[PDB]
Amino acid sequence: MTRRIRIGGAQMGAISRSDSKKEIVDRLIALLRQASEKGCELVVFPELALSTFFPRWYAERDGMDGYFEDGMPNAATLPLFEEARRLGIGFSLGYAELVQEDGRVRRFNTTVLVERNGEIVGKYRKIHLPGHAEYEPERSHQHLEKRYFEVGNTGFQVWDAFGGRVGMAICNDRRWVETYRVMGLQDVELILIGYNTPVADSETLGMFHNHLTMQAGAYQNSTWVVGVAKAGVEDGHRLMGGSVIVAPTGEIVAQAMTEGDELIVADCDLDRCRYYKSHIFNFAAHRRPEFYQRITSQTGVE
Amino acid sequence: TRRIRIGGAQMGAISRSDSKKEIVDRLIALLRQASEKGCELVVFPELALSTFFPRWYAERDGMDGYFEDGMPNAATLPLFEEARRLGIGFSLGYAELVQERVRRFNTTVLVERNGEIVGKYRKIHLPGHAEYEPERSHQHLEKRYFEVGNTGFQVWDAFGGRVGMAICNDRRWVETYRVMGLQDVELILIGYNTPVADSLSGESETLGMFHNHLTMQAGAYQNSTWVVGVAKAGVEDGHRLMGGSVIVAPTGEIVAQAMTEGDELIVADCDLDRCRYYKSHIFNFAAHRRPEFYQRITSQTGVE
């Protein structure tokens, strides 16, 4: 390996409504410390890793602000940032962002990327909000992400970090090909994706579709993909596991074995992204955007 | 209601010394196997009327002997007539020579069960290189003998549903499936010729079959469409072509797969209405897509 970075996928178990924030942060620090002991330079945390998956509960549009983060970091999450800064490990962390922008209060489903020196690299805000906005009793479970979050205003950004090109996406972003391709057009080499995927109380098909989208996005953009889950049963609601680290070949090189707090580790050579980028997936030599206009013109079918 | 029995007519190797009649006879034999199996649509490989000549270096017009002047012509008319007599439609890949000067395309034609042509697709993503490169174990000069197609990824009303076509290397690009998925495609027909050996090193690519199926299964699932991938396989004059022809359900599941590298027919009953189920439940384009963040896909060609 010529540009190797040891990545830890920090899958989390269930977070309940009755769990305090300190109990949640301590679980993150414990996963952070295990990655340190095994030599990881980057640990990937799930989507909304600082609270239970509250979009499953119905309340006022402002009634979930208790699960949001007033600042990043704040008094509750500072012990995680300082422990990571002491050990020299960067991390990506999903959380519910409460922010004051252009006059009003704004809410985003957000992931922050932090460098080994403790400096915040960048911030991705979720673009594809799934579920619904109003109460729908016809559903077996509510998924009210469109009620508590706004569409992010960052776009699929790619930063110079960890010696390469690092991008971020959140949850159901990973089943849209535009997610990987937009960052692939920014020469991305590592895509970090935390997720919370609800699952019925057979089940291989859901896991098959989960890995299929990430393995294809990795290969077809010749980039590493890290998908870190928040799994388990949260107050009767089951969340999908199967956290993986995917090579730019589409191969799974690390996979979670449990549905609780679990670290997966892989040595990831960023230079392995280079081969397909010069030949089979040489974008500048092969792509013909004059035939792709429907992708950026319309939303539905015609 | 909208069930269509599809036959995947994987072909064996075609040598430089094979005559066009011998090739047409093999296509007709596969066409008759599908008739006896009850197939209503048969998918043929890419460039199914000649050896895979992009591996050989000649002049830019030196491969015209492998091209088709008219579709059909005198040599290919027996295939169209047998298909029309059997009441079977088909998609056929060939090298197209057309006057507009002379233009050369990598093309697939779709023919309906009554023998009437519904449309043509011309290959958009041309792989390889345009000049001879001696450091390669084998050449792949598609950029030299073909120009970029001028049809786009069309989707037609045919065979009781929405049918689109792509060719070979197209199946590795997500834009191929998504452009047709945004046209409510339900069945994508893809013929391909994929060398087993890497062009630069000559070593066998161990993930070749994995990448072959991964891209088509992902395209099928992420666009809720059936995908049919049909290979020309075998050893063509010492050059091994990949097999693994497959019919894929809109779930991304493989429902039929070829087992050999020769002439082989795979058959599967494909209910196009399954696409409606997976388009309304999951993957609702009108409800989730945010094109204001996808502009790089059409605003630039390569990486920034």
Side-chain angles (χ1 to χ4, degrees), chain A residues 128 152 175-178 181 185 209 219-220 249 251 275-276 285-287 291-292 294-296 298-299 301-302, chain B residues 125 143 149 172 174-175 178 182 198 207 211 221-222 251 283 285 288-289 293-294 296-298 300-301 303-304:
Chain A
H128 303 97
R175 68 171 164 98
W176 299 109
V177 293
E178 296 86 345
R181 177 63 93 247
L185 290 163
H209 291 152
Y219 166 66
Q220 293 181 289
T249 61
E251 288 174 301
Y275 192 84
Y276 298 153
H286 300 324
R287 294 187 72 256
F291 297 114
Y292 310 158
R294 287 182 182 267
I295 299 179
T296 61
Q298 52 178 117
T299 303
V301 296
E302 181 257 25
Chain B
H125 303 105
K143 281 170 153 55
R172 305 180 186 275
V174 296
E175 297 89 341
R178 178 64 91 238
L182 290 165
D198 179 285
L207 300 176
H211 293 151
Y221 168 65
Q222 294 180 287
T251 62
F283 281 132
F285 287 175
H288 304 304
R289 295 188 76 257
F293 297 101
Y294 311 156
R296 287 183 182 269
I297 299 182
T298 54
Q300 53 183 94
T301 303
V303 301
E304 165 177 89

Short mmCIF file of all heavy atoms in Angstrom, two decimals, chain A residues 128 152 175-178 181 185 209 219-220 249 251 275-276 285-287 291-292 294-296 298-299 301-302, chain B residues 125 143 149 172 174-175 178 182 198 207 211 221-222 251 283 285 288-289 293-294 296-298 300-301 303-304:
data_model
loop_
_atom_site.label_atom_id
_atom_site.label_comp_id
_atom_site.label_asym_id
_atom_site.label_seq_id
_atom_site.Cartn_x
_atom_site.Cartn_y
_atom_site.Cartn_z
N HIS A 128 -31.55 14.17 0.44
CA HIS A 128 -32.73 13.34 0.19
C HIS A 128 -33.38 12.99 1.52
O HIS A 128 -32.92 12.10 2.23
CB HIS A 128 -32.35 12.09 -0.59
CG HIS A 128 -31.65 12.37 -1.89
ND1 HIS A 128 -30.28 12.34 -2.01
CD2 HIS A 128 -32.13 12.68 -3.11
CE1 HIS A 128 -29.95 12.62 -3.26
NE2 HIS A 128 -31.05 12.83 -3.95
N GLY A 152 -30.96 19.97 2.97
CA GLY A 152 -29.67 20.58 3.22
C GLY A 152 -29.26 21.53 2.11
O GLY A 152 -29.67 21.40 0.96
N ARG A 175 -28.78 5.10 -1.85
CA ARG A 175 -29.49 4.34 -2.88
C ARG A 175 -29.80 5.18 -4.11
O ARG A 175 -30.54 4.71 -4.99
CB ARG A 175 -30.77 3.72 -2.31
CG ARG A 175 -31.87 4.69 -1.93
CD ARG A 175 -33.14 3.91 -1.59
NE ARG A 175 -34.13 4.70 -0.87
CZ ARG A 175 -35.18 5.28 -1.44
NH1 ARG A 175 -35.38 5.16 -2.75
NH2 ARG A 175 -36.04 5.98 -0.71
N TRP A 176 -29.25 6.38 -4.21
CA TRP A 176 -29.34 7.20 -5.41
C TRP A 176 -27.97 7.25 -6.07
O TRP A 176 -26.97 7.55 -5.41
CB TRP A 176 -29.84 8.61 -5.09
CG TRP A 176 -31.21 8.61 -4.50
CD1 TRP A 176 -31.55 8.90 -3.21
CD2 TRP A 176 -32.44 8.28 -5.17
NE1 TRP A 176 -32.91 8.79 -3.03
CE2 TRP A 176 -33.47 8.40 -4.22
CE3 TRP A 176 -32.76 7.89 -6.47
CZ2 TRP A 176 -34.81 8.15 -4.54
CZ3 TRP A 176 -34.08 7.65 -6.79
CH2 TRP A 176 -35.09 7.78 -5.82
N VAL A 177 -27.93 6.95 -7.37
CA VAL A 177 -26.66 6.93 -8.09
C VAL A 177 -26.08 8.34 -8.20
O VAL A 177 -24.86 8.51 -8.31
CB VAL A 177 -26.83 6.28 -9.47
CG1 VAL A 177 -27.14 4.80 -9.32
CG2 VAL A 177 -27.92 6.98 -10.26
N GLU A 178 -26.94 9.36 -8.18
CA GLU A 178 -26.46 10.74 -8.28
C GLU A 178 -25.58 11.10 -7.09
O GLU A 178 -24.69 11.96 -7.22
CB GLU A 178 -27.64 11.71 -8.38
CG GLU A 178 -28.48 11.55 -9.64
CD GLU A 178 -29.58 10.50 -9.50
OE1 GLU A 178 -29.53 9.69 -8.55
OE2 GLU A 178 -30.49 10.49 -10.35
N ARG A 181 -22.06 9.75 -7.95
CA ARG A 181 -21.52 10.32 -9.18
C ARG A 181 -21.15 11.79 -9.00
O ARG A 181 -20.12 12.24 -9.51
CB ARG A 181 -22.52 10.15 -10.32
CG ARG A 181 -22.09 10.79 -11.63
CD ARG A 181 -20.81 10.17 -12.19
NE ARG A 181 -21.08 9.08 -13.13
CZ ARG A 181 -20.79 7.80 -12.90
NH1 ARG A 181 -20.22 7.43 -11.77
NH2 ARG A 181 -21.07 6.88 -13.82
N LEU A 185 -17.41 12.98 -9.62
CA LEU A 185 -16.97 14.05 -10.50
C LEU A 185 -16.10 15.08 -9.78
O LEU A 185 -15.57 15.98 -10.43
CB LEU A 185 -18.19 14.73 -11.12
CG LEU A 185 -18.93 13.87 -12.14
CD1 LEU A 185 -20.33 14.41 -12.40
CD2 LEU A 185 -18.14 13.78 -13.43
N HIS A 209 -30.05 -5.33 -0.89
CA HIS A 209 -30.20 -4.00 -1.48
C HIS A 209 -29.33 -2.97 -0.78
O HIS A 209 -28.83 -2.04 -1.43
CB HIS A 209 -31.67 -3.57 -1.43
CG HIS A 209 -32.55 -4.35 -2.35
ND1 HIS A 209 -33.89 -4.55 -2.10
CD2 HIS A 209 -32.29 -4.97 -3.52
CE1 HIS A 209 -34.42 -5.26 -3.07
NE2 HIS A 209 -33.47 -5.53 -3.95
N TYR A 219 -17.65 0.87 -6.85
CA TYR A 219 -16.97 0.41 -8.06
C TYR A 219 -17.16 1.40 -9.21
O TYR A 219 -16.19 1.80 -9.86
CB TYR A 219 -17.46 -0.98 -8.45
CG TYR A 219 -17.07 -1.39 -9.86
CD1 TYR A 219 -15.74 -1.60 -10.20
CD2 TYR A 219 -18.04 -1.59 -10.84
CE1 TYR A 219 -15.38 -1.98 -11.48
CE2 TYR A 219 -17.69 -1.97 -12.12
CZ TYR A 219 -16.36 -2.17 -12.43
OH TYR A 219 -16.01 -2.55 -13.71
N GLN A 220 -18.40 1.81 -9.46
CA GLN A 220 -18.70 2.66 -10.61
C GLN A 220 -18.16 4.08 -10.46
O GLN A 220 -18.23 4.85 -11.42
CB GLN A 220 -20.20 2.68 -10.86
CG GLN A 220 -20.75 1.33 -11.32
CD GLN A 220 -22.24 1.36 -11.61
OE1 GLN A 220 -23.05 1.45 -10.70
NE2 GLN A 220 -22.59 1.28 -12.89
N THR A 249 -13.18 -1.46 -5.81
CA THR A 249 -13.56 -2.57 -6.67
C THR A 249 -14.99 -3.03 -6.44
O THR A 249 -15.46 -3.92 -7.15
CB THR A 249 -12.61 -3.75 -6.45
OG1 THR A 249 -12.71 -4.20 -5.10
CG2 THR A 249 -11.17 -3.36 -6.75
N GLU A 251 -15.76 -4.51 -3.68
CA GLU A 251 -15.63 -5.61 -2.74
C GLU A 251 -15.80 -5.12 -1.31
O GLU A 251 -15.29 -4.06 -0.93
CB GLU A 251 -14.27 -6.28 -2.88
CG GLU A 251 -14.08 -7.10 -4.13
CD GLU A 251 -12.66 -7.62 -4.26
OE1 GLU A 251 -11.73 -6.78 -4.30
OE2 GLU A 251 -12.48 -8.85 -4.31
N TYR A 275 -6.62 3.33 -10.53
CA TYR A 275 -6.55 2.52 -11.74
C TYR A 275 -7.78 2.72 -12.62
O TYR A 275 -7.66 3.09 -13.80
CB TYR A 275 -6.37 1.04 -11.39
CG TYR A 275 -5.99 0.21 -12.59
CD1 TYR A 275 -4.67 0.11 -13.00
CD2 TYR A 275 -6.96 -0.46 -13.33
CE1 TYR A 275 -4.32 -0.64 -14.11
CE2 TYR A 275 -6.62 -1.22 -14.44
CZ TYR A 275 -5.29 -1.30 -14.82
OH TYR A 275 -4.94 -2.05 -15.92
N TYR A 276 -8.97 2.46 -12.08
CA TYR A 276 -10.19 2.61 -12.87
C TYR A 276 -10.37 4.05 -13.34
O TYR A 276 -10.95 4.27 -14.41
CB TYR A 276 -11.41 2.15 -12.07
CG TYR A 276 -11.39 0.69 -11.67
CD1 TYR A 276 -12.07 0.25 -10.54
CD2 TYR A 276 -10.69 -0.25 -12.42
CE1 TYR A 276 -12.06 -1.08 -10.17
CE2 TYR A 276 -10.68 -1.59 -12.06
CZ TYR A 276 -11.36 -2.00 -10.93
OH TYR A 276 -11.35 -3.32 -10.57
N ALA A 285 -12.62 10.92 -20.66
CA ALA A 285 -12.45 10.25 -21.94
C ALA A 285 -13.70 9.52 -22.42
O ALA A 285 -13.80 9.23 -23.62
CB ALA A 285 -11.29 9.25 -21.86
N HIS A 286 -14.64 9.23 -21.53
CA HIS A 286 -15.77 8.37 -21.87
C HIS A 286 -17.13 9.03 -21.72
O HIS A 286 -18.03 8.74 -22.51
CB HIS A 286 -15.73 7.10 -21.01
CG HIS A 286 -14.49 6.29 -21.18
ND1 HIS A 286 -13.83 6.16 -22.38
CD2 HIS A 286 -13.77 5.56 -20.28
CE1 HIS A 286 -12.77 5.39 -22.23
NE2 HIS A 286 -12.71 5.02 -20.97
N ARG A 287 -17.31 9.90 -20.73
CA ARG A 287 -18.64 10.42 -20.44
C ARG A 287 -19.11 11.37 -21.54
O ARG A 287 -18.32 12.10 -22.14
CB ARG A 287 -18.65 11.13 -19.09
CG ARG A 287 -18.40 10.18 -17.92
CD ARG A 287 -18.57 10.87 -16.56
NE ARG A 287 -19.97 11.15 -16.26
CZ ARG A 287 -20.52 12.36 -16.34
NH1 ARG A 287 -19.79 13.40 -16.71
NH2 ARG A 287 -21.80 12.52 -16.04
N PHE A 291 -26.05 13.53 -23.44
CA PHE A 291 -27.11 12.53 -23.39
C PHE A 291 -27.64 12.29 -21.99
O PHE A 291 -28.49 11.41 -21.80
CB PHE A 291 -26.61 11.21 -23.98
CG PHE A 291 -26.23 11.29 -25.43
CD1 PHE A 291 -24.92 11.12 -25.83
CD2 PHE A 291 -27.20 11.52 -26.40
CE1 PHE A 291 -24.58 11.20 -27.17
CE2 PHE A 291 -26.86 11.60 -27.73
CZ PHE A 291 -25.55 11.44 -28.12
N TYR A 292 -27.18 13.05 -20.99
CA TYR A 292 -27.58 12.86 -19.61
C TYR A 292 -28.54 13.93 -19.12
O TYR A 292 -28.78 14.03 -17.91
CB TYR A 292 -26.35 12.83 -18.69
CG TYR A 292 -25.23 11.90 -19.09
CD1 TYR A 292 -23.93 12.12 -18.63
CD2 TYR A 292 -25.44 10.80 -19.91
CE1 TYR A 292 -22.89 11.29 -18.98
CE2 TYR A 292 -24.40 9.96 -20.27
CZ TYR A 292 -23.13 10.21 -19.80
OH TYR A 292 -22.08 9.39 -20.15
N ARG A 294 -31.69 14.51 -18.98
CA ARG A 294 -32.87 14.18 -18.19
C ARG A 294 -32.55 14.08 -16.70
O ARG A 294 -33.41 14.35 -15.86
CB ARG A 294 -33.49 12.88 -18.68
CG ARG A 294 -34.21 12.99 -20.02
CD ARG A 294 -34.83 11.65 -20.40
NE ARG A 294 -35.50 11.71 -21.70
CZ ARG A 294 -36.79 11.98 -21.87
NH1 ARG A 294 -37.56 12.23 -20.82
NH2 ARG A 294 -37.30 12.00 -23.09
N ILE A 295 -31.31 13.70 -16.36
CA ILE A 295 -30.93 13.54 -14.96
C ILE A 295 -31.00 14.86 -14.22
O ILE A 295 -31.36 14.90 -13.03
CB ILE A 295 -29.53 12.89 -14.87
CG1 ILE A 295 -29.54 11.51 -15.53
CG2 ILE A 295 -29.07 12.79 -13.43
CD1 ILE A 295 -28.20 10.81 -15.52
N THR A 296 -30.67 15.96 -14.89
CA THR A 296 -30.65 17.27 -14.25
C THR A 296 -31.81 18.17 -14.68
O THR A 296 -31.94 19.28 -14.14
CB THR A 296 -29.32 17.98 -14.54
OG1 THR A 296 -29.17 18.16 -15.95
CG2 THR A 296 -28.16 17.15 -14.01
N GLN A 298 -35.44 16.97 -15.26
CA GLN A 298 -36.70 16.56 -14.68
C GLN A 298 -36.49 15.83 -13.36
O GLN A 298 -35.39 15.37 -13.04
CB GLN A 298 -37.48 15.66 -15.65
CG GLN A 298 -36.68 14.47 -16.17
CD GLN A 298 -37.49 13.58 -17.09
OE1 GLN A 298 -37.18 13.44 -18.27
NE2 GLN A 298 -38.55 12.98 -16.55
N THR A 299 -37.57 15.75 -12.58
CA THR A 299 -37.60 15.01 -11.33
C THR A 299 -38.31 13.67 -11.45
O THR A 299 -37.81 12.66 -10.94
CB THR A 299 -38.28 15.85 -10.24
OG1 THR A 299 -37.59 17.10 -10.10
CG2 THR A 299 -38.26 15.12 -8.90
N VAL A 301 -40.98 11.09 -14.18
CA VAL A 301 -40.86 10.34 -15.42
C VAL A 301 -41.62 11.06 -16.52
O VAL A 301 -42.58 11.80 -16.27
CB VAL A 301 -41.39 8.89 -15.26
CG1 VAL A 301 -40.53 8.13 -14.25
CG2 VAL A 301 -42.85 8.90 -14.83
N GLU A 302 -41.17 10.85 -17.76
CA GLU A 302 -41.82 11.44 -18.93
C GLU A 302 -41.88 10.44 -20.08
O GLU A 302 -41.96 9.23 -19.86
CB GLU A 302 -41.09 12.71 -19.37
CG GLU A 302 -41.73 13.41 -20.56
CD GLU A 302 -40.97 13.18 -21.86
OE1 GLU A 302 -40.27 12.15 -21.97
OE2 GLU A 302 -41.07 14.04 -22.76
N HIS B 125 -21.20 5.22 -25.05
CA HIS B 125 -19.94 5.11 -24.31
C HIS B 125 -19.03 4.13 -25.06
O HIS B 125 -19.21 2.91 -24.97
CB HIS B 125 -20.19 4.65 -22.88
CG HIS B 125 -21.12 5.55 -22.12
ND1 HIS B 125 -22.43 5.20 -21.85
CD2 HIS B 125 -20.93 6.77 -21.58
CE1 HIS B 125 -23.01 6.18 -21.18
NE2 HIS B 125 -22.12 7.14 -20.99
N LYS B 143 -12.96 3.24 -30.10
CA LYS B 143 -12.91 4.66 -30.41
C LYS B 143 -12.37 4.93 -31.81
O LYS B 143 -12.59 6.01 -32.35
CB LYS B 143 -12.05 5.39 -29.38
CG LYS B 143 -12.75 5.67 -28.06
CD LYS B 143 -11.76 6.17 -27.01
CE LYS B 143 -12.44 7.05 -25.98
NZ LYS B 143 -13.61 6.40 -25.32
N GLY B 149 -22.73 7.44 -30.75
CA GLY B 149 -24.06 7.36 -31.33
C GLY B 149 -24.83 8.66 -31.20
O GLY B 149 -24.58 9.49 -30.32
N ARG B 172 -21.98 -0.21 -17.51
CA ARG B 172 -21.15 0.16 -16.37
C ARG B 172 -21.35 1.60 -15.92
O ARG B 172 -20.82 1.99 -14.88
CB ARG B 172 -19.67 -0.07 -16.70
CG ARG B 172 -19.36 -1.48 -17.16
CD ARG B 172 -17.89 -1.67 -17.47
NE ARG B 172 -17.63 -2.98 -18.05
CZ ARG B 172 -17.43 -4.08 -17.33
NH1 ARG B 172 -17.44 -4.03 -16.00
NH2 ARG B 172 -17.21 -5.24 -17.94
N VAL B 174 -23.88 4.60 -14.64
CA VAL B 174 -25.18 4.76 -14.00
C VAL B 174 -26.10 5.64 -14.83
O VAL B 174 -27.33 5.50 -14.78
CB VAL B 174 -25.01 5.31 -12.57
CG1 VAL B 174 -24.26 4.32 -11.70
CG2 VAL B 174 -24.31 6.66 -12.59
N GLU B 175 -25.53 6.56 -15.62
CA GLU B 175 -26.35 7.43 -16.46
C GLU B 175 -27.14 6.63 -17.48
O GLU B 175 -28.22 7.05 -17.90
CB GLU B 175 -25.48 8.46 -17.17
CG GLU B 175 -24.76 9.43 -16.24
CD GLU B 175 -23.40 8.92 -15.78
OE1 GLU B 175 -23.16 7.70 -15.88
OE2 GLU B 175 -22.58 9.74 -15.34
N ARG B 178 -30.28 5.39 -15.55
CA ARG B 178 -31.08 6.47 -14.98
C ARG B 178 -31.79 7.27 -16.07
O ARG B 178 -32.95 7.67 -15.90
CB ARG B 178 -30.20 7.38 -14.12
CG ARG B 178 -30.94 8.57 -13.53
CD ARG B 178 -32.03 8.15 -12.55
NE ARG B 178 -31.54 8.08 -11.18
CZ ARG B 178 -31.60 6.98 -10.42
NH1 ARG B 178 -32.13 5.87 -10.89
NH2 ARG B 178 -31.13 7.02 -9.18
N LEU B 182 -35.75 7.47 -16.01
CA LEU B 182 -36.51 8.71 -16.06
C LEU B 182 -37.48 8.76 -17.23
O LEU B 182 -38.25 9.72 -17.35
CB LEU B 182 -35.56 9.91 -16.12
CG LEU B 182 -34.78 10.17 -14.83
CD1 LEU B 182 -33.62 11.11 -15.08
CD2 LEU B 182 -35.70 10.73 -13.76
N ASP B 198 -7.31 -8.39 -18.95
CA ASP B 198 -7.11 -6.95 -18.91
C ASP B 198 -6.33 -6.50 -20.14
O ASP B 198 -5.41 -7.18 -20.59
CB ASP B 198 -6.37 -6.55 -17.63
CG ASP B 198 -6.10 -5.06 -17.53
OD1 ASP B 198 -5.21 -4.56 -18.24
OD2 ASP B 198 -6.80 -4.39 -16.74
N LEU B 207 -12.38 -10.32 -10.88
CA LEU B 207 -13.64 -9.67 -10.55
C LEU B 207 -14.46 -9.33 -11.79
O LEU B 207 -15.42 -8.56 -11.70
CB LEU B 207 -13.38 -8.39 -9.74
CG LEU B 207 -12.66 -8.60 -8.41
CD1 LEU B 207 -12.39 -7.26 -7.74
CD2 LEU B 207 -13.48 -9.50 -7.49
N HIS B 211 -18.07 -7.69 -11.48
CA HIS B 211 -18.39 -6.36 -11.99
C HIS B 211 -19.46 -6.42 -13.07
O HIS B 211 -20.30 -5.52 -13.17
CB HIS B 211 -17.12 -5.69 -12.53
CG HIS B 211 -16.11 -5.37 -11.48
ND1 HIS B 211 -14.75 -5.34 -11.73
CD2 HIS B 211 -16.26 -5.07 -10.16
CE1 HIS B 211 -14.11 -5.03 -10.61
NE2 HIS B 211 -15.00 -4.87 -9.65
N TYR B 221 -32.13 -2.69 -9.99
CA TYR B 221 -32.77 -2.36 -8.72
C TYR B 221 -32.99 -0.86 -8.58
O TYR B 221 -34.10 -0.42 -8.25
CB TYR B 221 -31.92 -2.89 -7.56
CG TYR B 221 -32.35 -2.34 -6.22
CD1 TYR B 221 -33.59 -2.65 -5.68
CD2 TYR B 221 -31.50 -1.52 -5.48
CE1 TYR B 221 -33.99 -2.15 -4.45
CE2 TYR B 221 -31.89 -1.01 -4.25
CZ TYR B 221 -33.13 -1.34 -3.74
OH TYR B 221 -33.52 -0.84 -2.52
N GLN B 222 -31.96 -0.06 -8.84
CA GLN B 222 -32.04 1.37 -8.59
C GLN B 222 -32.93 2.10 -9.59
O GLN B 222 -33.19 3.29 -9.41
CB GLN B 222 -30.64 1.97 -8.57
CG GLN B 222 -29.80 1.47 -7.39
CD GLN B 222 -28.40 2.05 -7.36
OE1 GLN B 222 -27.55 1.68 -8.17
NE2 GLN B 222 -28.16 2.95 -6.42
N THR B 251 -35.90 -6.19 -8.88
CA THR B 251 -35.35 -6.26 -7.54
C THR B 251 -33.83 -6.33 -7.53
O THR B 251 -33.22 -6.28 -6.45
CB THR B 251 -35.89 -7.48 -6.78
OG1 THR B 251 -35.51 -8.68 -7.47
CG2 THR B 251 -37.40 -7.42 -6.69
N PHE B 283 -38.31 3.92 -4.53
CA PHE B 283 -37.75 4.56 -5.72
C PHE B 283 -38.79 5.38 -6.49
O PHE B 283 -39.00 5.19 -7.69
CB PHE B 283 -37.10 3.51 -6.63
CG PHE B 283 -35.74 3.07 -6.17
CD1 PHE B 283 -35.41 1.73 -6.11
CD2 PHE B 283 -34.79 4.01 -5.79
CE1 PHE B 283 -34.16 1.33 -5.68
CE2 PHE B 283 -33.54 3.61 -5.36
CZ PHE B 283 -33.22 2.27 -5.30
N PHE B 285 -39.34 8.53 -8.14
CA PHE B 285 -38.51 9.61 -8.67
C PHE B 285 -39.14 10.98 -8.41
O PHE B 285 -38.44 11.93 -8.04
CB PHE B 285 -38.27 9.41 -10.17
CG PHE B 285 -37.32 8.29 -10.49
CD1 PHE B 285 -37.09 7.93 -11.80
CD2 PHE B 285 -36.65 7.61 -9.48
CE1 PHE B 285 -36.21 6.90 -12.11
CE2 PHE B 285 -35.78 6.59 -9.78
CZ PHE B 285 -35.55 6.23 -11.10
N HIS B 288 -38.57 12.08 -4.49
CA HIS B 288 -37.30 12.12 -3.79
C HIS B 288 -36.19 12.84 -4.54
O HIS B 288 -35.30 13.40 -3.90
CB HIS B 288 -36.82 10.70 -3.45
CG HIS B 288 -37.81 9.90 -2.67
ND1 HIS B 288 -38.32 10.32 -1.46
CD2 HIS B 288 -38.39 8.70 -2.91
CE1 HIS B 288 -39.16 9.42 -0.99
NE2 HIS B 288 -39.22 8.42 -1.86
N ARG B 289 -36.20 12.82 -5.87
CA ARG B 289 -35.07 13.36 -6.63
C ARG B 289 -34.99 14.87 -6.49
O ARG B 289 -36.00 15.58 -6.54
CB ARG B 289 -35.18 12.96 -8.10
CG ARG B 289 -35.07 11.46 -8.33
CD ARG B 289 -34.98 11.11 -9.81
NE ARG B 289 -33.66 11.39 -10.38
CZ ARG B 289 -33.38 12.44 -11.13
NH1 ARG B 289 -34.33 13.32 -11.43
NH2 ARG B 289 -32.15 12.62 -11.60
N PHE B 293 -29.08 19.53 -7.15
CA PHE B 293 -27.79 19.12 -6.62
C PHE B 293 -27.05 18.17 -7.54
O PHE B 293 -25.97 17.68 -7.16
CB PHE B 293 -27.95 18.47 -5.24
CG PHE B 293 -28.51 19.40 -4.19
CD1 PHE B 293 -29.85 19.34 -3.84
CD2 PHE B 293 -27.69 20.32 -3.55
CE1 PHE B 293 -30.36 20.19 -2.87
CE2 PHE B 293 -28.20 21.17 -2.59
CZ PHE B 293 -29.53 21.10 -2.24
N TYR B 294 -27.58 17.88 -8.73
CA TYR B 294 -26.97 16.92 -9.64
C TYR B 294 -26.30 17.59 -10.83
O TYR B 294 -25.91 16.90 -11.78
CB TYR B 294 -28.02 15.92 -10.15
CG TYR B 294 -28.90 15.27 -9.10
CD1 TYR B 294 -30.15 14.78 -9.44
CD2 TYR B 294 -28.47 15.14 -7.78
CE1 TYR B 294 -30.96 14.18 -8.49
CE2 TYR B 294 -29.29 14.55 -6.83
CZ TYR B 294 -30.53 14.07 -7.19
OH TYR B 294 -31.34 13.48 -6.25
N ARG B 296 -23.50 18.74 -11.69
CA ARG B 296 -22.19 18.31 -12.17
C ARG B 296 -22.30 17.19 -13.19
O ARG B 296 -21.44 17.05 -14.06
CB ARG B 296 -21.31 17.87 -11.00
CG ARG B 296 -20.80 18.99 -10.12
CD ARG B 296 -19.88 18.44 -9.04
NE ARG B 296 -19.39 19.48 -8.14
CZ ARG B 296 -18.27 20.17 -8.32
NH1 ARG B 296 -17.51 19.93 -9.39
NH2 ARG B 296 -17.91 21.10 -7.45
N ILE B 297 -23.36 16.38 -13.10
CA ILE B 297 -23.51 15.23 -13.99
C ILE B 297 -23.63 15.67 -15.44
O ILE B 297 -23.19 14.95 -16.35
CB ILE B 297 -24.71 14.37 -13.54
CG1 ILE B 297 -24.48 13.85 -12.12
CG2 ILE B 297 -24.96 13.22 -14.50
CD1 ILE B 297 -25.58 12.95 -11.60
N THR B 298 -24.20 16.85 -15.69
CA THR B 298 -24.35 17.36 -17.04
C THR B 298 -23.53 18.61 -17.33
O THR B 298 -23.42 19.00 -18.49
CB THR B 298 -25.83 17.66 -17.34
OG1 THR B 298 -26.35 18.53 -16.33
CG2 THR B 298 -26.63 16.37 -17.37
N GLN B 300 -20.21 19.01 -16.48
CA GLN B 300 -18.82 18.67 -16.75
C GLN B 300 -18.74 17.24 -17.28
O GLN B 300 -19.64 16.42 -17.05
CB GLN B 300 -17.94 18.83 -15.50
CG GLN B 300 -18.44 18.11 -14.27
CD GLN B 300 -17.57 18.36 -13.05
OE1 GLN B 300 -17.85 19.25 -12.25
NE2 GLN B 300 -16.52 17.57 -12.90
N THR B 301 -17.66 16.96 -18.00
CA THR B 301 -17.43 15.63 -18.57
C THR B 301 -16.57 14.79 -17.63
O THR B 301 -16.98 13.70 -17.22
CB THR B 301 -16.77 15.76 -19.94
OG1 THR B 301 -17.59 16.56 -20.80
CG2 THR B 301 -16.58 14.38 -20.57
N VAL B 303 -13.56 14.76 -14.16
CA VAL B 303 -13.42 15.30 -12.82
C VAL B 303 -12.93 16.74 -12.89
O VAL B 303 -12.22 17.14 -13.82
CB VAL B 303 -12.47 14.43 -11.97
CG1 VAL B 303 -12.99 13.00 -11.89
CG2 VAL B 303 -11.06 14.46 -12.55
N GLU B 304 -13.32 17.53 -11.89
CA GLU B 304 -12.96 18.95 -11.85
C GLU B 304 -11.51 19.15 -11.43
O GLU B 304 -10.74 18.19 -11.31
CB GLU B 304 -13.89 19.70 -10.90
CG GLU B 304 -13.39 21.09 -10.51
CD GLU B 304 -14.38 21.83 -9.62
OE1 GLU B 304 -14.29 21.69 -8.39
OE2 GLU B 304 -15.24 22.55 -10.17
#
